[PDB]
Design a binder for this molecule. Structure first.
Ligand SMILES: Cc1cc2nc3c(=O)[nH]c(=O)nc-3n(C[C@H](O)[C@H](O)[C@H](O)COP(=O)(O)OP(=O)(O)OC[C@H]3O[C@@H](n4cnc5c(N)ncnc54)[C@H](O)[C@@H]3O)c2cc1C
Ligand SMILES: Cc1cc2nc3c(=O)[nH]c(=O)nc-3n(C[C@H](O)[C@H](O)[C@H](O)COP(=O)(O)OP(=O)(O)OC[C@H]3O[C@@H](n4cnc5c(N)ncnc54)[C@H](O)[C@@H]3O)c2cc1C
Lengths: 391, 391
């Protein structure tokens, strides 16, 4: 078989890129290692930037989102017995964020692809990439025990952190910047009304806590936990008791608890690779970089990488301007480093780090007080939170 | 002898407090361990906030400053082959900073005190503080081999980092927050015209560099050096060669060099003590806290502590409102922690730290790019640099 753009991974990055390209008349094939169900089992993201919201509209897959998504104009940070609200809308110049689960976004895209008739091969095992520097790269894989070959012009590695893509670039050609945090986030999804109409990020001595949501009758809560914790050691009961202990009393008493639909621990890490391409292979999303979930930037950076790659592929095909693709990494890396810096800051001011001296704790507290009390400080948080402009 | 307020230390803090009190009719005696000449030998500070400029005017010692001081409306940060200017005046709402050497400020105050006739005892050896929690505290010292006793109502510890004041409070009553940096600043004073009309803070791979000034024909330059360095290992020639290597080429070629009038290494450190008082003893300036020189906040925090103490002593004496003094530490600590956070940030983004991984270096560079390229980022630097409002 042959196609124009081969896409590895049917997560949100691959599906979004695939939908935009298909709509523009550029044929693409998506190869996914798992089943549709496995992909749909991941909860993950809840917060979307305006840029991603507009990109979903452009790919023509925003109906259900426009209907069920919740537009948020502010967020709240609780620390030292205070609850400060950041008016995102006012401080960012009118921008807001949208709460719509990653599971929903993925399901919408999967249905849009299914209807369009574009090629998607699930359970594509043993994917291997070949002749990345040639004019005719190709992908081989196994489906039903038989190894097939797929010829293409370009390959988009949208296979996440553990994908085959990044591993296929000669190690010596990439420079990795990584930071692993000494804690993870224990998340819990419950079919209960959220405790607030807006999100609440809490810095508490016992550790970080976050009150989020998916809809009016579905909530998503998180609490910082050491990397040594096992999810099986956290009953719903223990989770609720601990969450309550980390929130403002008035917030804790309004909390409606209930049995979990999902519970899991996500370890935190920062990771960037430079460059993000090699010959005819272009990395996008988690395949290229990881941000701690604190700043809600992961899926959002995937969106901007995808928007950038899509627009460069359009010029290559439609206008024969293939040279432009050389600029992919430079363009993406500028936005990536700024979102990484913001996610890093958010993570450092809201979490409890092991072995912190008295001076560091006071500075951490002072960072919150300064930034949440200054009009200029608030603006730096808001403009970064809503998402910096696409280049 | 007896007085109302006993002041330990004739550096800028003690002299400024002493002048303000004297003008308000409150008698004070200053005890200084060294000679007038020793005090006048210290170069130190060059940058003054507007608040300090106004306080000098209020104490009636601003003639020479208004005449010889240089008002600066912007500063520049050079990094990665770029030179970004921060318009302090525009971004802070019209505020600016004044360049006027600490040596000059001290000399002006010393002359003002001399003329007024207020008591100053130089070479006051073996100063000891007594009955800090009593109603009648007293200070003993040796002058010409004879131990004298000075009775007073209050004691202002304005004796710097190594003063006797902070050491006289029961250790168990204080909580210390401290951070010592792995580098120091090698400074050089030269009788040459500065390389720029504004200051230039430079982040360079070889390490930090700073181009400052005292007047139109006097400059003050600094370069970051390891704590193992000895000033005797740095000839004027070696200093100039190293400075040039750390500056933008166009800046390095306009540099007029010359023999040093002064050369010394100042190690960097952050230090805060809570509370800042004990009974009838109140700590002010370096006696209570130290900030790295990067943010130009040290002398400026001394000024706000002094303004706060002075205004509270006025209410105590003039209006019999002595209870107000209890609030000294709370008021000062709010401003101190914010200036400490800013000096810490400035220090972390402009210096080369030993053993920094690739990720940290990229984040450091990204911090500069984000903050110097965002209107909101620039504002956070400017409002903090000009100095946050006095409470
Ligand atoms: C707890 C948590 C909360 C988060 N919250 C937010 C939020 O609020 N906002 C935000 O922006 N981000 C958030 N994120 C991050 C966001 O979920 C990820 O950035 C996003 O899933 C990345 O999408 P992707 O398509 O790049 O990769 P993925 O979702 O990882 O999908 C990659 C796909 O490629 C497939 N694949 C892997 N190996 C191969 C192979 N060899 N061959 C074929 N297929 C392969 C995988 O099966 C997978 O289906 C959060 C993440 C977590 C963990
Ligand atoms: C290289 C460098 C650059 C700087 N640049 C700036 C700048 O641009 N802007 C800014 O705001 N800050 C800056 N600072 C800091 C500023 O110089 C200090 O914060 C300031 O000197 C503090 O004044 P002080 O009066 O509290 O203490 P000090 O200047 O330390 O004076 C205390 C006095 O008390 C005396 N004393 C000590 N022990 C006793 C005792 N037992 N009995 C009696 N007397 C005693 C000492 O002899 C001394 O005279 C800089 C500092 C350095 C080192």
């Amino acid at each position: 078989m042959k196609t124009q753009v081969a896409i590895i991974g049917a997560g949100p990055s691959g599906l979004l890129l695939g939908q935009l390209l298909h709509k523009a008349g550029i044929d693409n094939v998506i190869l996914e290692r798992q089943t549709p169900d496995y992909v749909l089992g991941k909860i993950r993201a809840g917060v979307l930037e305006q840029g991603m919201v507009d990109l979903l509209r452009e790919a023509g897959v925003d109906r259900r989102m426009a209907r069920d998504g919740l537009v948020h104009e502010g967020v709240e940070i609780a620390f030292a017995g205070q609850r400060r609200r950041i008016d995102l809308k006012r401080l960012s110049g009118g921008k807001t964020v949208t709460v719509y689960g990653q599971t929903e976004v993925t399901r919408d895209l999967m249905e849009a692809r299914e209807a369009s008739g574009a090629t998607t091969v699930y359970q594509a095992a043993e994917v291997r990439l070949h002749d990345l520097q040639g004019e005719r790269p190709y992908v081989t894989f196994e489906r039903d025990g038989e190894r097939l070959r797929l010829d293409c012009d370009y390959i988009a590695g949208c296979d996440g952190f553990h994908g085959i893509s990044r591993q296929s670039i000669p190690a010596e050609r990439l420079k990795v910047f990584e930071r692993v945090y000494p804690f993870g986030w224990l998340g819990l999804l419950a079919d209960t009304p959220p405790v607030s109409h807006e999100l609440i990020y809490a810095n508490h001595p016992r550790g970080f806590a976050l009150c989020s949501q998916r809809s009016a009758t579905r909530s998503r809560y998180y609490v910082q936990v050491p990397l040594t914790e096992k999810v099986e050691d956290w009953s719903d009961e223990r989770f609720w008791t601990e969450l309550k202990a980390r929130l403002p009393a008035e917030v804790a008493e309004k909390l409606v608890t209930g049995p979990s639909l999902e519970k899991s621990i996500a370890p935190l890490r920062s990771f960037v690779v430079e460059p993000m391409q090699h010959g005819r292979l272009f990395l996008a999303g988690d395949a290229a970089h990881i941000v701690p979930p604190t700043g809600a930037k992961g899926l959002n950076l995937a969106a901007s990488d995808v928007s950038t790659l899509y627009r460069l592929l359009l010029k290559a095909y439609r206008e024969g301007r293939g040279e432009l693709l050389e600029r992919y990494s430079a363009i993406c890396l500028r936005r990536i480093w700024k979102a990484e810096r913001f996610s890093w800051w958010m993570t450092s001011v809201l979490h409890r780090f092991p072995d912190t001296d008295a001076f560091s704790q006071r500075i951490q507290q002072t960072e919150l007080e300064y930034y949440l009390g200054s009009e200029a400080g608030l603006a730096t948080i808001a403009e970064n939170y809503v998402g910096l402009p696409y280049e």
